[PDB]
Design a protein around this ligand. Sequence first.
Ligand SMILES: CCO/N=C/c1ccc(OCC[C@@H](C)CCN2CCN(c3ccncc3)C2=O)cc1
Ligand SMILES: CCO/N=C/c1ccc(OCC[C@@H](C)CCN2CCN(c3ccncc3)C2=O)cc1
Ligand SMILES: N[C@@H](CCC(=O)N[C@@H](CS)C(=O)NCC(=O)O)C(=O)O
Lengths: 235, 235, 59, 263, 263, 68, 68
Amino acid sequence: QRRSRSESTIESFFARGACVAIIEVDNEEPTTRAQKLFAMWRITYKDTVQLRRKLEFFTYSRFDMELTFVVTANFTNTNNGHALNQVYQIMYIPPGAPTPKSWDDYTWQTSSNPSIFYTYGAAPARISVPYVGLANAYSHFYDGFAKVPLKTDANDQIGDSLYSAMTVDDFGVLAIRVVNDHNPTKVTSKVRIYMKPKHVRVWCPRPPRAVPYYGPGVDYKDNLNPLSEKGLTTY
Amino acid sequence: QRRSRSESTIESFFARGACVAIIEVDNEEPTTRAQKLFAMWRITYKDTVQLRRKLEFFTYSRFDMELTFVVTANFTNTNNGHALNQVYQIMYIPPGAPTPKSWDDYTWQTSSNPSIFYTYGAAPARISVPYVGLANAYSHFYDGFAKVPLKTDANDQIGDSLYSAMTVDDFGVLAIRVVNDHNPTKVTSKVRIYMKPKHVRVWCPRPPRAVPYYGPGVDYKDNLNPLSEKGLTTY
Amino acid sequence: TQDSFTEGGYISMFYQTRIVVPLSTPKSMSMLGFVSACNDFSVRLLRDTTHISQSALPQ
Amino acid sequence: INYYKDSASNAALQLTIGNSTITNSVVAYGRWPEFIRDDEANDQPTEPDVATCRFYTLDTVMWGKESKGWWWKLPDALRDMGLFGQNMYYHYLGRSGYTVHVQCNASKFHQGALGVFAIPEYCLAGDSDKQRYTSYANANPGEKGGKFYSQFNRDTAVTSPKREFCPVDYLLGCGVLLGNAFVYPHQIINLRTNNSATIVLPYVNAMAIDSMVKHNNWGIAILPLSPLDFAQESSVEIPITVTIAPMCSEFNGLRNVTAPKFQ
Amino acid sequence: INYYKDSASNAALQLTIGNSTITNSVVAYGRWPEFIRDDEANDQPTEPDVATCRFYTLDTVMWGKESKGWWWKLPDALRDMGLFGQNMYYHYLGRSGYTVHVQCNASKFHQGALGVFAIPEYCLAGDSDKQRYTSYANANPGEKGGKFYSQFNRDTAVTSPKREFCPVDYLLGCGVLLGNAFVYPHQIINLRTNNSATIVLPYVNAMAIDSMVKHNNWGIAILPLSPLDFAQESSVEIPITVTIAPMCSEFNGLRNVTAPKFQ
Amino acid sequence: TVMWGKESKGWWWKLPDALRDMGLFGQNMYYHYLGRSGYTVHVQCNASKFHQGALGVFAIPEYCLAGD
Amino acid sequence: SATIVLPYVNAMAIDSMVKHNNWGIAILPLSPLDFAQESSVEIPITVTIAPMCSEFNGLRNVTAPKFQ
Ligand SMILES: CCO/N=C/c1ccc(OCC[C@@H](C)CCN2CCN(c3ccncc3)C2=O)cc1
Ligand SMILES: CCO/N=C/c1ccc(OCC[C@@H](C)CCN2CCN(c3ccncc3)C2=O)cc1
Ligand SMILES: N[C@@H](CCC(=O)N[C@@H](CS)C(=O)NCC(=O)O)C(=O)O
């Protein structure tokens, strides 16, 4: 036979689970000072760089998503007894929905918002999501603004907006809490989120990133000397 | 193609599990004073507000139900040893059936009443129930009384009844206990109940609630200024 | 939700000629407004509302 | 494939009625009143044809600048109207539809607007901290009806509580904004265009037939959407009249007469 | 066998245009500009035929030994070109393709090479520690365009930051090596072979039609791949000219005129 | 809008002169050497039943006026 | 209210719009305005115009007439 290009397809190139978020949640006795009883994470893939760099090969994309959650817990001390198995609640809050202000407020009723209840020690949680883009395709790069200043504006701040930003709040957030009450001993936990694109279509290929990322945009600050030395007539 | 209304259907609108009850049960050495060894909860959806508000969009409804139970346990102290995995018993008591007076009385034999035995650390429990309404549809709103006073009544209390109430005891109760004997260390636990309507039909739409609920009825006490200020000729 | 990237537009009203009344007639009047959706209206992505809240569970 | 046996386990002009005549109409939910069908019942019903299906006129009310609204309950308002009330009190079970006609006439120099709403299972709020403590007598005023208020006046009596409703105009007396009340069957009387309103209400309930004494099936609410005015006069008052005609009425469960204690 | 209902759960020469004439071409992605089809829309569009689809010539620039490059944004560069700009500012939604012609003439004793690149969604980097802080005015220079630099000059102002781009020639102003810029649609002008370049750009965007004021669809970058030289002269300068013709332009959403504040 | 009273004597306008600064019509008028168009004219004036009066509206081709 | 529809009238099929006006509109009070027995009466009059079937030719730089 002859060599094939089965593994160079777009689907195969993105058929891997890539970490996109590490989130910390703690269980302990509530106190006046700041605590990590519940956490909120803004959904995106730009926190990490590997999946971001792989996706930025193209200007436009359209795909469904698969999310997997891995939870790891540990103690902090030894003289405050032990704890029983904990249950974690993960809730998806789309834009416009109320956001929690405490680990036990009414917002956790999740009457309409989807939620996942995970029991520690079981298999990592998993879900799937379809394409939820307002337009016909996701826009990795956007060359424009959300507002245009006008001569008749009273002040310059009316039309001021960040460059290369479509919407301030996009795709909602994920809120993670520990449903169990506090044991006499504090327990810390980390949730790792892994993302896998599926049914992927792409448009307008672009050259890959060559210098370290700096912010959500295309800005560069340091390490602008990627290539190394080599002789002109040296093999 | 053209935009569809798949997600605006009645079934989709109610295709979510909503919390309706948080119940506390404790395991410890029995004593003369009051304790929480076993608990009884009266079945209803008016304890919470999100599902209540969603359902009150219509005057009449007819649906089956799906119930899910999530259990979370914890310790209270550290110097009284530990405990082994516990088993929880949940029993449905319809109207007219005997009710328990202790955590270990004969009523728990559940010869005819259905019961669920749940082992801690397993998947959340789940069951389904059909439409069990005496009439042809559930009545969210009832404008009437259960008794009518008469001129020939000896006293005024014979015909006195609460307004907008059909039956005092409706749909029975749920009794939750810990089957295990008491360990030297107290263990607390909370059971959260989530309800999902299925095969839903509705009649007579009504405007939604605009002020905070106050009691099982339509009474309002405080926070009667919902709308905010805005200029007449201000965009 | 409020967002400049999905702004819809503006609605305004003005007088064309004016209100004219005869004698022995009220010079002030009231107007009412209504809104509705057409048959080509669709929604997506069910989510919870911010118009209802709760502070304490029934005891 | 479904495994369990139970389905629940499965994964998801002149109008003349009887001897009465009145000289466009609105049909609630597009359903005309009709009698019970043979495929739904629970004895021989009693079905008066003309002795009860006719127009009865209630007491006239007065609309001025400070009026806030009025409300009535059906079939409560007709409990003392000819043989209809006698049949209502002589039978355990009753059923009926209604035709409601609201009359209010003015001149071309007047201005105003009335909104009439028919509400199924119209439940009103109380006037005390206690919940669902309203009395039967206060909840069934009769043909006189009740009135709305612009503010919530909590009852301060502790010895002899009034046990009465305290409806609020802008909350429709039930905690919902008035602007959405148009979701219910409704009519608008604008003095510059028309002078009357008509509505037809079929029988609506979770049961085919139910008692008429302890349960009211319909509520009628009339509110001034725009204040009344006339030329430049300080005070203006005009009459408003209501007429109601039962339609397709059935009764069952004959026995001795019921005598409720109204105060 | 698929169990879940949702699919997501499933496991994976002379060219004449209008009244203008210019005397091989490159078509981007092998797609000619075209109008919107009936199977994709969101009112009656306005589609000028000859009043806007014609060649407009920008300001000439000068290329010397120390020149590093130039860049322009479309449709920004044509905001003040005849009726095209008026239609752009009088409508909420716009769409169009482009034809770009670059002219540069020299003698047989000159030498050099220019690379012209058309980039969709061409985003440039800032000149400050703050991220995405560039201003609208600085990001839309107009027909004058901008220039590239050989080094990153961080802005030291703290009171009145400039809020301007700082493109780098060998990074293409976006953090990618220039050598790979040929992945985009491109042309090469070599003085020993040719003296002009032509490119045709269709409308590219995630939406069928979008606003032209707050979003730029295309970017044009011209860079000297080889330095300019002539005989043994110390200083050499030659002119470079750019002409752009809109093609198949549509507008929708007529209303009062927009007046952006450019400084 | 204009105002009509007891001492008003009349008003006149010229077309296409009156529309020289109306949206893109004026821009096309000033960007082209030759132009052509028809017109639809609508005159609005509302009063009560107790008012009285009469207005005459005339469309005149090649309407030339006298000097002073 | 009043409505009129005016077609294009001229000795030539197409002509310049800047130096030549094709139509004139004249509004005159045939009868004086009055109301009850009031001494002074004023009411508004409004005019709306819609171009129809407009053609342009001869594209070139923009004309800027000097109006005062
Ligand atoms: C019960 C909890 O389960 N709910 C989970 C869930 C997960 C993901 C959901 O969608 C989040 C958005 C994703 C489809 C990925 C969004 N992408 C695609 C394009 N994009 C992006 C980001 C920054 N710049 C350009 C594009 C993104 O970040 C919705 C719900
Ligand atoms: C072994 C334990 O499993 N048994 C569980 C079980 C669960 C639910 C059961 O039915 C309880 C009644 C439900 C069908 C919901 C009753 N609803 C519907 C109408 N409604 C209501 C409440 C207040 N005002 C109006 C209507 C309700 O509260 C019966 C047994
Ligand atoms: N923080 C309160 C209890 C909070 C509570 O019960 N909140 C209700 C509504 S106000 C709820 O929805 N809780 C969700 C949950 O935490 O499971 C307390 O213990 O004093």
